[PDB]
């Protein structure tokens, strides 16, 4: 059974993605992108009411496989639109003049590894060479610095870096469609947990983007808007200043292919719980998290 306030096991996610597809034909489309290293469907969906050249936003979910509340963020953002069209007028205009690709797990086989085996599993779970230790880190795994700083060449290591930028099945998939869909795509969010940051390019070296004082500006306001639901505290700014140094990362990557508006979000908490975000607070953390990512995409829409 599926609940939109409790954490999903991949088995409740794949369905949920072809029923809340089937429940809502006009607006919800689903496609996969490629396949995982175990051989799982890398399901996309395409949220937005069809129209004639729209532009796009791409958000994923679900990198790192002990970040739940991540692949949780992506269902509730599902939920919100499904639920509040024709209601609220921002989301609704949203949809009709934009569409959202919400991929709600990048890294399935981890997922599933944190329900049966290992709570703790960050990596895919692939396997490397000349070792029995599994798994890339796919936000090592992009070609943006790859695998200079903040990451490891070590295959038994939490940020290995692959054995090349897009060795793994899953980076690749999600590379090649922002790739064959360049054109349309003006926005890439890709969300994470935690430490309570959005985090924009870049993270690879200490250097900023074109864009900065816009991005700067744009991540300032998405921040002060969360912060009005629950008084909840983000820090904000380039990826290697605001939380460290860490190269060959998909925001990044997306960035350096002309997407400006390029934002990895780190959600609550600040550690107490850490990756062990206890269900009772899915709803107030994505509450909050939608207020954030509806003003990035009411500024993304007034920019084209
Ligand atoms: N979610 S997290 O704890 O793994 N933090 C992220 C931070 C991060 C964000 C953007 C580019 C590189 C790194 C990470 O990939 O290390
Ligand atoms: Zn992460
Ligand atoms: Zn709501």
Redesign the pocket.
């Given at each position: 059974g599926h609940s939109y306030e409790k954490y999903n096991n991949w088995e409740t996610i794949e369905a949920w993605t072809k029923q809340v597809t089937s429940e809502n034909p006009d607006l919800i489309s689903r496609t996969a992108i490629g396949t995982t290293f175990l051989g799982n469907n890398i399901y996309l969906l395409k949220v937005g009411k069809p129209g004639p050249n729209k532009p796009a936003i791409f958000m994923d979910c679900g990198?790192?496989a002990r970040?739940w509340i991540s692949h949780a963020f992506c269902q509730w953002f599902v939920r919100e639109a499904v639920l509040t069209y024709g209601y609220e007028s921002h989301m609704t205009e949203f949809l009709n003049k934009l569409d959202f690709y919400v991929l709600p797990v990048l890294n399935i086989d981890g997922y599933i590894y944190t329900w049966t085996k290992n709570r703790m599993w960050?990596k895919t779970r692939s396997t490397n060479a000349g070792t029995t230790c599994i798994g890339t880190?796919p936000?090592?795994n992009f070609d943006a610095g790859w695998c200079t700083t903040?990451a490891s060449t070590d295959p038994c290591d939490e940020?290995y870096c692959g054995s090349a930028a897009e060795s793994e099945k899953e980076t690749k998939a999600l590379a090649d469609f922002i790739r064959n869909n360049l054109s349309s795509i003006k926005a890439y969010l890709?969300i994470?947990?935690?430490?309570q940051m959005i985090?924009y390019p870049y993270?690879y070296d200490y250097k900023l983007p074109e864009n900065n004082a816009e991005l700067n500006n744009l991540a300032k306001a998405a921040v002060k808007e969360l912060a009005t639901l629950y008084g909840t505290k983000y820090t904000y700014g380039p990826?290697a200043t605001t939380?460290?140094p860490?190269a060959?990362?998909?925001?990044?990557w997306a960035y350096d292919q002309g997407i400006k508006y390029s934002f990895?979000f780190?959600l609550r908490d600040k550690g107490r719980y850490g990756f062990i975000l206890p269900e009772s607070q899915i709803q107030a953390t994505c509450e909050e998290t939608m207020l954030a990512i509806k003003y990035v995409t009411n500024y993304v829409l007034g920019h084209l």
């Open positions: 990198f790192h970040e960050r880190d936000n090592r903040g940020t890709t994470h947990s935690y430490s985090l993270s990826g939380i460290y860490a060959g990362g998909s925001d990044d990895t780190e």
